[PDB]
Design an enzyme around this catalytic site. Structure first.
Site, mmCIF file in Angstrom:
data_model
loop_
_atom_site.group_PDB
_atom_site.id
_atom_site.type_symbol
_atom_site.label_atom_id
_atom_site.label_comp_id
_atom_site.label_asym_id
_atom_site.label_seq_id
_atom_site.Cartn_x
_atom_site.Cartn_y
_atom_site.Cartn_z
ATOM 1 C CD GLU A 111 17.802 -13.393 20.013
ATOM 2 O OE1 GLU A 111 18.820 -13.193 19.311
ATOM 3 O OE2 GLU A 111 17.628 -12.866 21.138
ATOM 4 C CE1 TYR B 165 -0.185 10.117 6.159
ATOM 5 C CE2 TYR B 165 -0.419 10.431 3.792
ATOM 6 C CZ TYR B 165 -0.985 10.151 5.025
ATOM 7 O OH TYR B 165 -2.347 9.939 5.100
ATOM 8 C CB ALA C 7 -8.043 -1.633 -2.471
ATOM 9 C CB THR D 258 -7.034 8.673 3.327
ATOM 10 O OG1 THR D 258 -6.788 7.313 3.741
ATOM 11 C CG2 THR D 258 -5.711 9.427 3.132
ATOM 12 N N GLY E 41 0.807 -1.209 0.000
ATOM 13 C CA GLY E 41 0.000 0.000 0.000
ATOM 14 C C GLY E 41 0.838 1.254 0.000
ATOM 15 C CD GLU F 296 -2.438 5.138 -6.121
ATOM 16 O OE1 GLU F 296 -2.608 5.686 -5.006
ATOM 17 O OE2 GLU F 296 -2.129 5.767 -7.161
ATOM 18 N N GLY G 283 -6.031 1.571 4.768
ATOM 19 C CA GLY G 283 -6.207 1.511 3.323
ATOM 20 C C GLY G 283 -6.743 0.175 2.862
ATOM 21 N N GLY G 284 -7.296 0.130 1.649
ATOM 22 C CA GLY G 284 -7.853 -1.095 1.091
ATOM 23 C C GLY G 284 -6.796 -2.102 0.695
ATOM 24 C CB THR G 285 -3.559 -1.696 -1.232
ATOM 25 O OG1 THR G 285 -4.257 -1.262 -2.393
ATOM 26 C CG2 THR G 285 -2.335 -2.492 -1.643
HETATM 27 N N1 LIG Z 1 2.598 7.116 8.767
HETATM 28 C C1 LIG Z 1 2.079 6.986 7.550
HETATM 29 N N2 LIG Z 1 0.781 6.707 7.412
HETATM 30 C C2 LIG Z 1 0.386 6.660 6.109
HETATM 31 C C3 LIG Z 1 1.161 6.861 4.976
HETATM 32 N N3 LIG Z 1 0.384 6.760 3.835
HETATM 33 C C4 LIG Z 1 -0.823 6.497 4.289
HETATM 34 N N4 LIG Z 1 -0.894 6.424 5.656
HETATM 35 C C5 LIG Z 1 -2.079 6.128 6.490
HETATM 36 O O1 LIG Z 1 -2.607 4.873 6.098
HETATM 37 C C6 LIG Z 1 -4.053 4.919 6.094
HETATM 38 C C7 LIG Z 1 -4.581 4.796 4.681
HETATM 39 O O2 LIG Z 1 -3.967 3.677 4.014
HETATM 40 P P1 LIG Z 1 -3.137 3.845 2.637
HETATM 41 O O3 LIG Z 1 -1.750 3.212 2.786
HETATM 42 O O4 LIG Z 1 -2.924 5.234 2.176
HETATM 43 O O5 LIG Z 1 -3.900 2.966 1.549
HETATM 44 P P2 LIG Z 1 -3.525 1.835 0.485
HETATM 45 O O6 LIG Z 1 -2.884 0.648 1.151
HETATM 46 O O7 LIG Z 1 -2.635 2.353 -0.576
HETATM 47 O O8 LIG Z 1 -4.922 1.344 -0.100
HETATM 48 P P3 LIG Z 1 -5.776 1.952 -1.299
HETATM 49 O O9 LIG Z 1 -5.133 3.259 -1.773
HETATM 50 O O10 LIG Z 1 -7.166 2.023 -0.672
HETATM 51 O O11 LIG Z 1 -5.749 0.929 -2.379
HETATM 52 C C8 LIG Z 1 -4.392 6.221 6.809
HETATM 53 O O12 LIG Z 1 -4.427 5.989 8.214
HETATM 54 C C9 LIG Z 1 -3.236 7.119 6.375
HETATM 55 O O13 LIG Z 1 -3.103 8.294 7.168
HETATM 56 C C10 LIG Z 1 2.563 7.146 5.158
HETATM 57 O O14 LIG Z 1 3.398 7.343 4.284
HETATM 58 N N5 LIG Z 1 2.928 7.187 6.495
HETATM 59 MG MG LIG Z 2 -2.957 3.751 -2.510
#
Ligand SMILES: Nc1nc2c(ncn2[C@@H]2O[C@H](COP(=O)(O)OP(=O)(O)OP(=O)(O)O)[C@@H](O)[C@H]2O)c(=O)[nH]1
Ligand SMILES: [Mg+2]
Ligand SMILES: CC[C@H](C)[C@H](NC(=O)[C@@]1(C)CCCN1C)C(=O)N(C)[C@H](C[C@@H](OC(C)=O)c1nc(C(=O)N[C@@H](Cc2ccc(N)cc2)C[C@H](C)C(=O)O)cs1)C(C)C
Ligand SMILES: Nc1nc2c(ncn2[C@@H]2O[C@H](COP(=O)(O)OP(=O)(O)O)[C@@H](O)[C@H]2O)c(=O)[nH]1
Ligand SMILES: Nc1ncnc2c1ncn2[C@@H]1O[C@H](COP(=O)(O)OP(=O)(O)O)[C@@H](O)[C@H]1O
Ligand SMILES: [Ca+2]
Ligand SMILES: [Ca+2]
Ligand SMILES: [Ca+2]
Ligand SMILES: [Mg+2]
Ligand SMILES: [Mg+2]
EC number: 3.6.5.-
Lengths: 54, 427, 338, 441
Positions: D254, D224, D99, D179, D10, D71, D143-145
């Site tokens: 461990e 981020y 996702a 998000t 993701g 993506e 996130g979905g992924t």
């Molecule tokens: N600390 C941190 N949190 C992140 C980052 N990118 C996204 N998040 C957090 O992760 C969550 C959203 O998941 P994402 O990783 O963006 O989603 P994804 O896995 O790409 O899934 P989709 O885009 O839905 O296909 C939220 O809580 C965001 O604030 C990052 O670089 N650092």
């Molecule tokens: Mg994404």
């Protein structure tokens, strides 16, 4: 306060410090659930297409 | 998810659809020829969402212009940006729909609909990854109303997996005097409830009252109303056109905004409200204004309902700390107006590029249960004529039956009942 | 405009606290399940402490200290006194107490009890759940099998005259978000309207000074005062005219030492100093005074109630020093220094 | 020498991954072109760094990593990155359509159609391993992924490598950076699905990270980029032991051994000190005693919770830089008397300690200052269950109304899977409470 298992190395050192003593699904099942969802999606899409043709 | 196909149907649809491309073209630094002449590369990072790039690095809008009469489209072609649009993408008839939903949906529209879909198909081919569809139209006429909803239904058959989103203009007796409009509007809502993923409820009553009471325009014109519509359209699509985290695609927007599939009618908001003819707004002002009844594009009092979900977009160079401060202040000061059973339902985006002539703006998108007020209005007007079967001959003379009308009436009444369900729901 | 939630409808104290907050016209009461509040006036048992301090833009404060139940649960209080070196088994102001299950303290209880029988020392004890008064080990241990604490019964208590009547001093203590220990200047004496029976322990009327047992099992209830409520100014007058000393000198001094020593002990375990949320709490300290004018601690109440005439002053002190200190708008206490 | 494969799923997994592999290179003196002057054995070696970095005959030090997002935008910045030369094109895997913050779309719909290509690219790495230890999986819960695709991959990894260790770095959802509104649903769904397949998971509540940056780094509105440079520091402390000749947590087993007494309770709490802003001209250097004490401060933890109102089942102190045992044992004596550290009766109240002479490293042109000494405390406390109680309540508020549920069901998921996933969480909460603990008047 005890000190035990003193491990030494070139980039580190370690030990334990006791202050007080005490007192999976198979690939077959994965595809079964992944196919059942695709078949639940396929039914929903065809039911929509049925309603749209009506 | 990447490319959005835009379709504009009828007089209202084509007028507001035209104003949309003029506004976002300037935003993305595209001249009336299609040539790029901008200062920032933020303008092209997501240009392909709305524009097809052509040979000689010229940008063509991914827009389809539909009408059952040549009139409006001829004035759009004669217009400033008419030259930007692909000429093969102008699909029109000669008959007209005569403000009759039955003509747009079943008789006249039926004759033109496949020629539109061939253009929809061609556009869908040149897409690396199509997101879905965008439609501009009024619900009170015949073409955008009747033909628009038939086009949505036909597009849904060929693209069932894609997102269907509309900018639907609601009728008002303050703007129009066509008696049949409540009939056409109820027939169109029934369609929107079933076949769209997201609908921006753009109300002519609210646009008229904003122009009269707030912009102090004595005799507002369509162009005055359309000015607020083009501002709203530019704001609600920002997240799709510029780099960002929140609601950057149609699907992610729908998942954040639609808790229940029929409850997808959004109450758009905007601050500052302006007329086409200096004084910048503070982050606290933008926040008070965007959530204020007077700034809503739908004639509903948000204080009469509860917000199921909210999306807030801030445009320009401001404090992300202060945006966050004011957004949290608004939620914490009025927590009763936000359903407790949808935790953290207000999501905020900030985009560095503001609109033309504004140093800073704020666009609100709300899924409030107060939208039932707009639906109760169209329903009151529909029932008053339908209980005496008045003006039905115009519809039955096109092959329709009273049954379709009773069904449409029921679905909209059920939708109002659903919005009440969740207004009286507790955790 | 600050926000609060009421999650304990039965609390007379925070019902008045709620009433006074709204009355300022700077506080709004939200639905008991609305998270966007500043102040939680939480439920007695199972308060969701883990959920507080996670709402951005909101400074959150609760009317309970997480872990203050170590001092307020009968068996826990005994355990805290016995294990903590700050109090230890070398503690003069708390009666001899043993935790008995129907881990255990059954072995060490018999050991200290039998040393008193042969030592020709008074062996009167008391039993209570976290009610029995007997001298034999049988009647005590047999009763628990019908979790309790067996505490040394105060054989030689001080008695108010006229009446030859038993009593107990209830003091109200407020510990704010900064751990400032505030003792309310007003206290009450839960008197026993029936005379004390030196040999008879069967009649549980002259031994239990509770306001509930006096309005139920006592015949001469409301004779000397109203009902069995003696206040400090009155009790001080009895101490000067009938005993020469003052309430401050003979009793209040020891009470203050007990409050402080108890609350300082658990400060490292319940202090909300570097925490995402802040806590404050009203406590009801229950004391017994012997004939030698020595103060003993009976129980600590986590959810006390007040004497009807003092609600007005106590509940205003709560909003003043515990609430408006954290949430400022537009002394009736004694600050116990530590 | 035993190898470790890092998998980044993701946006969160990929962006954190980037921040980690960048710190790893500054720490091991590996250049953006993949060249390491300090490595004198060209095109091979059985060194401690070779656990994470494979080698080429040209002398390229190549991360043993897989990047997967549904993506392109995010992974196309690993391809455009400063460290673009480092990675093989088949190490970076992208879809077209994401996702849509929907676990069901990530798990079932897009998952089913890309799972085999991912496991392929993973085996392509596993076949360059003399004796693979296991996997380090980075992803978001929200996130979905991050939730859907990860849970699917974890079940398949359990099949294809049942003998191997699977460790997690999971980003717990926080509204300040969230998000999506459905992040509680996605979090519980993936937690339930990944439970049996995870040996040790390190949770990082984005709210704690955001607050450390606001408070200690004096950042008005942390990004981020800021959040990930800090996560990168904690991840580096945990993995330093595998990448350098160390004495403690020398292999992935461990971690389970030293931290996980019960397999379901495999979420250790990570505390890290000192966090100082680089924008500070003056810096008073903190002692071993100061930084050790700070490991018991909720303001420094990766999840805000009160470890005082819970029990310890494991505790381990990982020091970095100029640290001698004398100062460590004295600080362990000092804090034991001051702080209320209750352990489980069947466990000895004690600490496993490790010092890694390797100095604390920072990105030049960062918000974080270079420190002489640092420490990461990994402790298995039942106080972490507070994060579960918060997320479970959010899930419950929404589920009672079946809000957004249709989005899941529309992707093929059954409504029953939601309450199943939730009953497991109610079980997990009950386990933590069993271990952790014993009117008007
Ligand atoms: N600390 C941190 N949190 C992140 C980052 N990118 C996204 N998040 C957090 O992760 C969550 C959203 O998941 P994402 O990783 O963006 O989603 P994804 O896995 O790409 O899934 P989709 O885009 O839905 O296909 C939220 O809580 C965001 O604030 C990052 O670089 N650092
Ligand atoms: Mg994404
Ligand atoms: C004498 C009848 C007038 C014209 C009409 N009155 C009514 O309908 C009333 C008020 C009278 C009885 C009750 N009823 C509701 C009216 O004011 N309207 C219908 C206006 C719209 C009307 O206003 C005026 C003052 O002309 C029109 N505006 C335009 C206009 O904006 N034209 C622009 C081009 C255009 C043409 C058609 C479309 N659909 C969109 C745009 C050009 C002008 C210069 C501009 O940019 O404003 C044309 S007619 C609406 C907004 C209430
Ligand atoms: N805001 C706005 N409303 C319009 C415009 N043109 C038409 N309408 C409204 O749309 C309705 C009539 O529909 P119209 O689009 O003209 O008919 P169609 O061509 O048959 O779809 C009435 O409610 C009009 O007031 C326009 O440019 N802007
Ligand atoms: N050890 C004791 N010696 C003498 N009297 C006692 C003792 N313990 C309790 N009492 C009497 O019992 C009464 C009630 O006891 P208490 O522990 O306060 O229970 P409760 O929680 O039900 O209020 C006291 O007011 C006092 O008169
Ligand atoms: Ca015809
Ligand atoms: Ca080598
Ligand atoms: Ca396993
Ligand atoms: Mg027309
Ligand atoms: Mg208002």
């Amino acid at each position: 306060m005890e000190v035990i298992e003193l491990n030494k190395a070139t980039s580190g050192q370690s030990w334990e410090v006791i202050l007080k003593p005490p007192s999976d699904p198979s690939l077959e099942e994965i595809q079964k659930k992944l196919e059942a969802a695709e078949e639940r999606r396929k039914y929903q899409e065809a039911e929509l297409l049925k309603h749209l043709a009506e | 998810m990447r490319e959005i196909v835009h379709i504009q149907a009828g007089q209202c649809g084509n007028q507001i659809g035209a104003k949309f491309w003029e506004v976002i073209s300037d935003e993305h630094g595209i001249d009336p020829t299609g040539s790029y002449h901008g200062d920032s590369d933020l303008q092209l990072e997501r240009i392909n969402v709305y524009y097809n790039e052509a040979t000689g690095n010229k940008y063509v809008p991914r827009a389809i212009l539909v009408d059952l009469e040549p009139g409006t489209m001829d004035s759009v072609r004669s217009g400033p940006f008419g030259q930007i649009f692909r000429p093969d993408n102008f699909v029109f008839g000669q008959s007209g729909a005569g403000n009759n939903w039955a003509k747009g949906h079943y008789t006249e529209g039926a004759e033109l609909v496949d020629s539109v879909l061939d253009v929809v198909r061609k556009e869908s081919e040149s897409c690396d990854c199509l997101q879905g569809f965008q439609l501009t139209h009024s619900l009170g006429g015949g073409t955008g109303s009747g033909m628009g909803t038939l086009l949505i239904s036909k597009i849904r058959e060929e693209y069932p997996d894609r997102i269907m989103n509309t900018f639907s203009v609601m009728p008002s007796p303050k703007v129009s005097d066509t008696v049949v409009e409540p009939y056409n509007a109820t027939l169109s809502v029934h369609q929107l409830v079933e076949n769209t993923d997201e609908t921006y409820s753009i109300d002519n009553e609210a646009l008229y009252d904003i122009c009269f009471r707030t912009l102090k325009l004595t005799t507002p014109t369509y162009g005055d109303l359309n000015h607020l519509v083009s501002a709203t359209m530019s704001g609600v699509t920002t997240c799709l056109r510029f780099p960002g985290q929140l609601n950057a695609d149609l699907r992610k927007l729908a998942v954040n905004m639609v808790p229940f599939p029929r409850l997808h009618f959004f109450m758009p908001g905007f601050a500052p409200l302006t007329s086409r003819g200096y004084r910048a707004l503070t982050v606290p002002e933008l926040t008070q204004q965007m959530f204020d009844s007077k700034n809503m594009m739908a004639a509903c009092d948000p204080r009469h309902g509860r917000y199921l979900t909210v999306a807030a977009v801030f445009r320009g160079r401001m404090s992300m700390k202060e945006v966050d401060e004011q957004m949290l202040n608004v939620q914490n000061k009025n927590s009763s107006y936000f359903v407790e059973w949808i935790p953290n339902n207000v999501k905020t985006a900030v985009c560095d590029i503001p609109p033309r002539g504004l140093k800073m703006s704020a666009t609100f998108i709300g899924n409030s249960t107060a939208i039932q007020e707009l639906f109760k209005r169209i329903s009151e007007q529909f029932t008053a004529m339908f209980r005496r079967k008045a003006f039905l001959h115009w519809y039955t003379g096109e092959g329709m039956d009273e049954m379709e009308f009773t069904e449409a009436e029921s679905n909209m009444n059920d939708l109002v009942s659903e919005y009440q369900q969740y207004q009286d729901a507790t955790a | 405009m600050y926000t609060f939630v009421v999650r304990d409808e039965n609390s007379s104290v925070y019902a008045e606290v709620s009433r006074l907050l709204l009355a300022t016209g700077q506080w709004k009461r939200l639905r008991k399940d609305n998270p966007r509040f500043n102040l939680m006036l939480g439920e007695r048992n199972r308060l969701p402490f883990g959920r507080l301090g996670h709402e951005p833009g909101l400074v959150q404060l609760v009317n309970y200290y997480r872990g203050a139940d170590k001092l307020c649960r009968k068996a826990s209080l005994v355990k805290l006194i016995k294990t903590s070196p700050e109090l230890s088994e070398s503690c003069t102001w708390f009666p001899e107490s043993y935790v008995i299950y129907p881990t255990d303290e059954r072995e060490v209880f018999l050991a200290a009890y039998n040393r008193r029988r042969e030592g020709r020392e008074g062996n009167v004890w008391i039993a209570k759940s976290s009610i029995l008064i007997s001298s034999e080990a049988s009647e005590l241990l047999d009763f628990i099998d019908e979790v309790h604490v067996i505490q040394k019964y105060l054989e030689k208590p001080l008695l108010l005259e006229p009446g030859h009547r038993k009593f107990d001093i209830r003091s109200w203590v407020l510990v704010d978000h900064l751990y400032n220990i505030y003792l309310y200047r007003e206290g009450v004496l839960r008197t026993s309207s029936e005379p004390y029976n030196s040999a008879n322990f069967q009649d549980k009327t002259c031994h239990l000074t509770n306001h509930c047992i006096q309005k139920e099992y006592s015949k001469n209830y409301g004779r000397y005062e109203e009902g069995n409520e003696m206040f400090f100014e009155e009790f001080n007058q009895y101490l000067m005219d009938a005993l020469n000393t003052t309430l401050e000198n003979s009793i209040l001094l020891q009470i203050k030492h007990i409050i402080r020593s108890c609350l300082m002990c658990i400060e490292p375990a319940i202090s909300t100093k570097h925490l995402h949320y802040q806590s404050f709490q009203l406590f009801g300290f229950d004391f017994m005074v012997d004939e030698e004018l020595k103060v003993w601690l009976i129980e600590v109440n986590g959810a006390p109630a007040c004497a009807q005439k003092l609600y007005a002053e106590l509940c205003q002190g709560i909003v003043d020093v515990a609430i408006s200190s954290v949430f400022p708008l537009a002394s009736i206490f004694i600050k116990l220094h530590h | 020498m035993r190898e470790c494969i890092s998998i980044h799923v993701g946006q969160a997994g990929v962006q954190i991954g980037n921040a980690c592999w960048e710190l790893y290179c500054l720490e091991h003196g590996i250049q953006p072109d993949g060249q390491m002057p300090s490595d004198k054995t060209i095109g091979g070696g059985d060194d401690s760094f070779n656990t994470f970095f494979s080698e080429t005959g040209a002398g390229k030090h190549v991360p043993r990593a897989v990047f997967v997002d549904l993506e392109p935008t995010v992974i196309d910045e690993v391809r455009t990155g400063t460290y673009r030369q480092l990675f093989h094109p088949e190490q970076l895997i992208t879809g077209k359509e994401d996702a849509a913050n929907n676990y069901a779309r990530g798990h079932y719909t897009i998952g089913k159609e890309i799972i085999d290509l991912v496991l392929d690219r993973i085996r392509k790495l596993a076949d360059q391993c003399t004796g693979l230890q296991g996997f380090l999986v980075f992803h978001s819960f929200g996130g979905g992924t991050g939730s859907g695709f990860t849970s699917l991959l974890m079940e398949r990894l359990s099949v294809d490598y049942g003998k191997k260790s699977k460790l997690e770095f999971s980003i717990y959802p926080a509204p300040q950076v969230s998000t999506a509104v459905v992040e509680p649903y996605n979090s519980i769904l993936t937690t339930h699905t990944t439970l049996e397949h995870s040996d040790c998971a390190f949770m990082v509540d984005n709210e704690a990270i955001y607050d450390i940056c606001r408070r200690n780094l004096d950042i008005e509105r942390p990004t981020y980029t800021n959040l990930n440079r800090l996560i990168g520091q904690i991840v580096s402390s945990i993995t330093a032991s595998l990448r350098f000749d160390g004495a403690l947590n020398v292999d992935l087993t461990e971690f389970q051994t030293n931290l996980v007494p019960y397999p379901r309770i495999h979420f250790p709490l990570a505390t890290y000190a000192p966090v100082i802003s680089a924008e500070k001209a003056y810096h008073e250097q903190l002692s071993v005693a100061e930084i050790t004490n700070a490991c018991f401060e909720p303001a420094n933890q990766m999840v805000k919770c009160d470890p005082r109102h819970g029990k310890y089942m494991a505790c381990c102190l990982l020091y970095r830089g100029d640290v001698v045992p004398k100062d460590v044992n004295a600080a362990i004596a000092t804090i034991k008397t001051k702080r209320t550290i209750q352990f489980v009766d069947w466990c000895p109240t004690g600490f496993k300690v490790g010092i890694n002479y390797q100095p604390p490293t920072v990105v030049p042109g960062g918000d974080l200052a270079k420190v002489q000494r640092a420490v990461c405390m990994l402790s298995n406390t039942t106080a972490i269950a507070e994060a579960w109680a918060r997320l479970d309540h959010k899930f419950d508020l929404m589920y009672a109304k079946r809000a957004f549920v249709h989005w899941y069901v529309g992707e093929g998921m059954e409504e029953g899977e939601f309450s199943e996933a939730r009953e497991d969480m109610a079980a997990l909460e009950k386990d933590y409470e069993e271990v952790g603990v014993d009117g008007e008047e």
